[PDB]
From a paper:
There are three parts to the flagellar structure: the trans-membrane basal body that functions as the motor, the connecting rod and hook, and the flagellar filament that acts like a helical propeller. Our current understanding of supercoiling in bacterial flagellar filaments, referred to as polymorphic switching, is based upon the notion that protofilaments within the flagellar filament can exist in two discrete states, that differ slightly in length. The “short” state results from a protofilament having a right-handed inclination (the R-state), while the “long” state results from a protofilament having a left-handed inclination (the L-state). To reconstruct filaments at high resolution, all protofilaments must be “locked” into the same state, either L- or R-type, producing straightened filaments that lead to non-motile bacteria.
While the three L-type mutants (E115G, S285P, and S17P) have a left-handed 11-start helix, the four R-type mutants (N226Y, A233V, H84R and A39VN133H) have a right-handed 11-start helix, and the designations L and R correspond to the hand of these 11-start helices. The L-type 11-start helices are tilted left by ~ 1.7° and the R-type 11-start helices are tilted right by ~ 3.9°. The residue N226 in B. subtilis is not a conserved site and does not form any conserved interactions with other subunits. In the R-type N226Y mutant, the side chain of Y226 in subunit S+5 forms new hydrogen bonds with the side chain of Q110 and the main chain of T107 in subunit S0. But in the L-type subunits, Y226 likely causes major steric clashes. Therefore, N226Y filaments adopt a right-handed form.
Residue numbers in the entry:
A (entry chain L), E (entry chain A), F (entry chain K): 3 to 51
B (entry chain V): 52 to 254
C (entry chain L), G (entry chain A), H (entry chain B): 255 to 304
D (entry chain f): 52 to 152
């Protein structure tokens, strides 16, 4: 049990919630939800036209 | 629950884009009104025979009015929200074949049949009507608009060249563009009250 | 009206986003916290060891 | 005792979801009110005959009001908490047959 | 409780009162209550005539 | 909401009311309603004769 | 008289509208304010967490 | 009329520009702000470190 602690999930929730605060960083600091195309392709495809 | 939450927010945004489209259409109907007012004025004075004659000094007025009707054709054709023509006969209310209504189904809710159906029509031939406009009257009172020479002939008692009928049909055109424009304001009220329901139920 | 709908698509309601940001940042600090509890489990394993 | 404890917490959550549902229904009734106020106003002025005539300039008002009543039908139909329609006659108080309340 | 804060109502009162200051912006900056047809269709239908 | 303020209508009412004070500027400073032919073509066509 | 009634319909009493505007703007700033209080609730949840 | 169209090309509607300026300046201050949040992420990494 010692050689592999079971709070590896904690690393994943840290690396997801940390990964999400930063999606809000990019998304806020430009005002745009489709700052990055990987949020909603549909809204891009429409909004471009 | 998540399904209905997210779909209910997106249902709000759907209704909001619906508001936007309707605001565009209605703006086109605003400028339609202003033009039809000009038309009505030109008809009143053009019906001021006895002083407004030479008959080619009605031809001039006719030319102006014909330009305005061309502008109604313009607005009815070029009005587009995201490229989509609205005012033209694509979105007739109800033909003799109800299989060709092609309503403006808006999605409004996160579930089945939670939708609103909207229709719209007007163009050069948006004067009086029964099922179609009519022949000699009731569309060319918004496309041709008599006074080329065609009031100095007769005054009030011919039903296709008389001032009373002609002007009456301009008043019909104003009345029913006003009616169509009056539906869609209420539609905007529907969608605002809706979005309030969607934010509440959403929360 | 096009600008309006276009903004409804792309442009963000930054209040909601800010609440989302504070929220997720708390989830982050809570998670690092639960490392500060989680790694402390085998040292007590060393305690019964000594 | 455990049975009643856990079931009593879950009874709390049950009541809380009940609150939520009711809040949704009631919100639908809020927008119902606002609409009915509009209706009442349109009726008052539409009852201001002598000046509000042409009679088709009441037809227009009628059209508006009919749209609002269509919205009441809408709200009564589309109001759903987790897909479940509430406002419609599913949940009548007491019919002549109390076996169908 | 943390993953969904209960002041979502606050977003709705912000997005309604903010949405209403602007209805007063359009309504004031033209002088017209029926600037936009979605305020009262009746007043439009009469006022046009 | 920030990257596109909703008082763009305000720019249009400014660019219409401002555009109309000036139509009154040209129209007043010559005394003529048909200073510019784009006010009423009929009145021009008659008044010329 | 037609212009008068027509104005009573469409044209606004801009004083009343301005009071409505200041009012609703205060409701807006009050609401953003209550975000500035509302988001501050779970950070104290992090405080008992640490 | 030439001066008019020439102005429509080059000369700016300074109201719209001013709204654009206030807007973009808020985006700037928001971005510096999100540095004030962003740099604060690894100090909590130092917190679980100690």
């Amino acid at each position: 049990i010692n050689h592999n602690i079971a709070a590896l999930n904690t690393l994943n929730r840290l690396s997801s919630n940390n990964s999400a605060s930063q999606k809000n960083m990019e998304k806020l600091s430009s005002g745009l939800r489709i700052n990055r195309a990987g949020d909603d392709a549909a809204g891009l495809a429409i909004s471009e036209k | 629950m998540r399904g209905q939450i997210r779909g209910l927010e997106m249902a709000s945004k759907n209704s909001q884009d619906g508001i936007s489209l309707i605001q565009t259409a209605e703006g086109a109907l605003t400028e339609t009104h202003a033009i039809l007012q000009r038309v009505r004025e030109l008809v009143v004075q053009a019906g001021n025979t006895g002083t407004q004659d030479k008959a080619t000094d009605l031809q001039s007025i006719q030319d102006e009015i014909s330009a305005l009707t061309d502008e109604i054709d313009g607005i009815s054709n070029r009005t587009e929200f995201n490229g989509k023509k609205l005012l033209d006969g694509t979105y007739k209310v109800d033909t003799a074949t109800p299989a060709n209504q092609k309503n403006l189904v808006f999605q409004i809710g996160a579930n089945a049949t939670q939708q609103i159906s909207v229709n719209i029509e007007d163009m050069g031939a948006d004067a009086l009507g029964i099922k179609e406009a009519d022949g000699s009257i009731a569309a060319l009172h918004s496309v041709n608009d008599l006074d080329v020479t065609k009031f100095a002939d007769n005054a009030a008692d011919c039903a296709d060249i008389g001032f009373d009928a002609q002007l009456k049909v301009v008043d019909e055109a104003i009345y029913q563009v006003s009616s169509q424009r009056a539906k869609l304001g209420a539609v905007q009220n529907r969608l605002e009250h809706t979005i309030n329901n969607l934010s509440a139920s959403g929360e | 009206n096009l600008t309006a709908a276009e903004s409804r698509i792309r442009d963000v309601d930054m209040a909601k986003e800010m609440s989302e940001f504070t929220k997720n940042n708390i989830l982050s600090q809570a998670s690092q916290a639960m490392l500060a509890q989680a790694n402390q489990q085998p040292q007590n394993v060393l305690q019964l060891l000594r």
